[PDB]
Amino acid sequence: LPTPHEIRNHLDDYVIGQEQAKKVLAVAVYNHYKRLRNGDTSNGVELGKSNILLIGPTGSGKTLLAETLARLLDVPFTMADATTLTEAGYVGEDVENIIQKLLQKCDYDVQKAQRGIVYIDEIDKISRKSDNPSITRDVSGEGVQQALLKLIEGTVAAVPPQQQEFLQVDTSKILFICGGAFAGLDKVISHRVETGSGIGFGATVKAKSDKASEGELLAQVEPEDLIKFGLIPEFIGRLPVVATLNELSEEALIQILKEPKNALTKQYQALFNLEGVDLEFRDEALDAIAKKAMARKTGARGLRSIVEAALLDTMYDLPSMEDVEKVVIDESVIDGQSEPLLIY
Amino acid sequence: SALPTPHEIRNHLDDYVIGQEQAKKVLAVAVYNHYKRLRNGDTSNGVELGKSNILLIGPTGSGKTLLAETLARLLDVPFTMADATTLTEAGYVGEDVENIIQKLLQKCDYDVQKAQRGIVYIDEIDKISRKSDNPSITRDVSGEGVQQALLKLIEGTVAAVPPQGGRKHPQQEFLQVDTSKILFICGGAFAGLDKVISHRVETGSGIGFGATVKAKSDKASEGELLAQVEPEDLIKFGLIPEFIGRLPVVATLNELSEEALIQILKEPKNALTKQYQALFNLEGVDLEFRDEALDAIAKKAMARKTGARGLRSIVEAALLDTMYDLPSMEDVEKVVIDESVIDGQSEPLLIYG
Ligand SMILES: Nc1ncnc2c1ncn2[C@@H]1O[C@H](COP(=O)(O)OP(=O)(O)OP(O)(O)=S)[C@@H](O)[C@H]1O
Ligand SMILES: Nc1ncnc2c1ncn2[C@@H]1O[C@H](COP(=O)(O)OP(=O)(O)OP(O)(O)=S)[C@@H](O)[C@H]1O
Ligand SMILES: [Mg+2]
Ligand SMILES: [Mg+2]
């Protein structure tokens, strides 16, 4: 019987920050459990479902939230690509593949599948760039969206085996969570509340808002902006809950190095201990690597590349070296000007 | 037999649907006629009674799908719901048009006789429409192809429904089902149809000095255009002329106004406000919505342009913080939400008892 606070604490153990989005997923999961426990509600009232939509830059942890949250979930869970889907009548993979994919973790059971949770990533890619029907029916941006319109609410869909039974499974009680890096969307929101004046004299010129981070603009996202981005109004309606993330800053990246349980620093420490050596990272060293990552715009994913190169030489001669007790990493080795300290 | 009269059946529909009078009467008349034709199965009189398919056109969140669900409850005949997007032209991986009848058989317990007198609802019918360049120099299977295959099925034909799908899989005598008495109701939100209607009813002019109409920006809303819908406009949208003909009666909805949203919040049997109240009751805390608060959410929902679905996001966002801390906090017996909480200027009010 987990509660919103309990779910929040468990999620914070793996991913830090993103408090705004953490409350959205925690409350949604708690509400889902209550509905599953009591469907009729003993009052003749049918409880609906509220789908979520995640809008954040790449490397912000959108997929990390679903993976970590999946462990706590006690119901079947699955992930989707959103890029391999195709409209009915075309090669590839129909949208129905999401439902059957969930059955993989539910031992192919309809009863348990109806109470599962489905998460789709990379939803931004499936969007009509032209914002209107093209000369030929799009099979990746518009075709997939139309099929998903009716698949997000009820619409009992067949489940092709793995021979033609096509067992029916209800999708009315299956919560749907969406998420994707809507590239360029930040500009759509800005243009809506950026300028509303003319050019020549006699115009109510308005001062442009000071430089605002991408996270601030996304915080003001509304369905109108999504429509102009290439999302049909029907699809937006299916996703009432809207949450946005914030780009990681210098302080956020430094925290991700130690605070997370599965942080890259902890993983490397255990790796060295496997062969019989201990590794430690100085506070200054962590700050240097974090700053370098943002300089190259590589993001959070780059933290693993910088550290790998810095310790590449040490790991080459680490197991071969004998009579070694500890390894010290400072700020002078991040830039490569000084060889990492080693004691015997 | 005690066949429900159109007025009685319409009253039940009002319980789950609000702000819809033209569509409720059309559906009530067609369903009532369906029962009458069932009694006269042998058509004692020389003249044989036919069927009149319906077509629903309206914006998103207008109650097109909700009407089919609520009506299916009263319909004693097997009722089925199908998606036009999944359907494709025959001979392809996508589901064929014959699958519609297959699903109906399951609802009737493999009873072919009962399948003859049935009602189907092809939701998202507007999806299968000729896109730009109606001629379609290329072969279209998920668009015009579906409409062509639906010409004989909607009008009525003997389709050899496969005997699989929950029954004996091996090859056997394919069941013969006649769709000459199945009332087909197509419903979908034809996006962009309003623009085509305006180009016809509303006269347009270019640039000039005399005999030119400026046509100021402030004109009739798109709702009025949808009301005066002509089959010619539908053909220009992408529907083949032979397809629109199968649907003689066409009922159009109207965009929900501010007053309509308020009624939908309480009057419906399963309303948005009542759903949240029950959710809070499970943990042991009551929920109440002030009259002024309902007005604020309704007004803010209209600007969303997402139909009735907008109310779901407005109430969820306002109560996002309430539900996140309510279970953790104890000694809570009720929550009061006023107008000052909808706009977010003041946090939700709570009383400890
Ligand atoms: N806030 C964060 N805290 C800790 N680690 C993070 C965070 N954000 C990203 N990471 C790390 O970055 C890795 C990849 O990030 P993702 O979860 O893929 O974010 P993403 O934006 O969803 O990527 P996509 O889906 O390809 S756009 C994760 O496995 C984490 O190790
Ligand atoms: N007339 C109405 N009365 C009460 N609730 C309504 C009404 N219209 C819409 N709703 C609400 O909106 C929800 C969605 O209804 P739908 O009919 O499925 O929307 P829709 O218009 O069918 O979407 P499209 O256009 O088919 S994609 C319902 O479950 C109700 O909660
Ligand atoms: Mg991802
Ligand atoms: Mg619908």
**CB contacts, 8 Å: B270 with chain A:** 45-46
Ligand 4 midpoint to CA B68 (Å) = 9
DSSP string for residues in A249-292: -HHHHHHHHHSSTT-HHHHHHHHHHHHT-EEEE-HHHHHHHHHH
Q: Is B127's CB within 8 Å of A137's CB?
A: no
Residue B336 structure tokens = 């009061």
- Interhelix angle B258-266/B310-318, rounded to 10 degrees, is 70
| A77 φψ region: left (φ > 0), alpha (ψ -120 to 50), beta (else) | beta
Q: Does A23 touch chain B (CB under 8 A)?
A: yes
Q: What are phi and psi for residue A177, nearest 5 degrees?
A: -120, 125
Q: Is B305's CB within 8 Å of A5's CB?
A: no
**CB contacts, 8 Å: B124 with chain A:** 146, 149-150
Q: Which of A300, A286, A180, A259 is nearest to A12 (CA)?
A: A259
Q: Decide: B165 and B110 in contact? Cβ < 8 Å.
A: no
The separation between the first and the last C-alpha atoms of chain B, rounded to the nearest angstrom, is 56
Partners of residue B185 on adjacent β-strands: B54, B121
| C-alpha separations of A55 from A158, B55, B333 in Å | 31, 37, 36
Q: Does B310 touch chain A (CB under 8 A)?
A: yes
Q: Among B88, B189, B316, whose Cβ lies nearest the Cβ of A89? A: B88
Closest Cα in chain A, distance from residue B242 (Å): 22
Q: Cα-Cα-Cα-Cα dihedral of A271, A273, A277, A282, to 10°?
A: 70
- Is A121 a pocket residue for ligand 1 (Cβ < 6 Å)? yes
Ligand 2 midpoint to CA B49 (Å) = 33
Q: What are phi and psi for residue B337, nearest 5 degrees?
A: -120, 125
| H helices present in chain B, as ranges | 6-16, 22-39, 64-74, 99-107, 112-116, 144-155, 193-201, 222-227, 231-237, 241-245, 258-266, 272-283, 291-302, 310-318, 320-325, 339-342
Q: Which residue has the tokens 């080459």?
A: A316
Residue nearest to atom 1 of ligand 1 (CA): A61
**CB contacts, 8 Å: B286 with chain A:** none
Query: With b meaning 16 or more CB within 10 Å and e meaning fewer, what string describes A317-334?
Result: ebeeeeebeebebebbbb
Determine the Cα–Cα distance for residues A216 and A20; give it in Å rounded to an integer: 12
Burial label for B13, CB within 10 Å (0-12, 13-18, 19+), is buried
Angle at B275 between CA B251 and CA A169, to 5 degrees: 70
| Residues in the 5 Å CB sphere of ion ligand 3 | A 63, 121
How was this structure determined? It was done by cryo-EM
| C-alpha separations of A268 from A280, A288, A299, A312, A322 in Å | 9, 17, 20, 12, 19
Q: Is A236's CB within 8 Å of B85's CB?
A: no
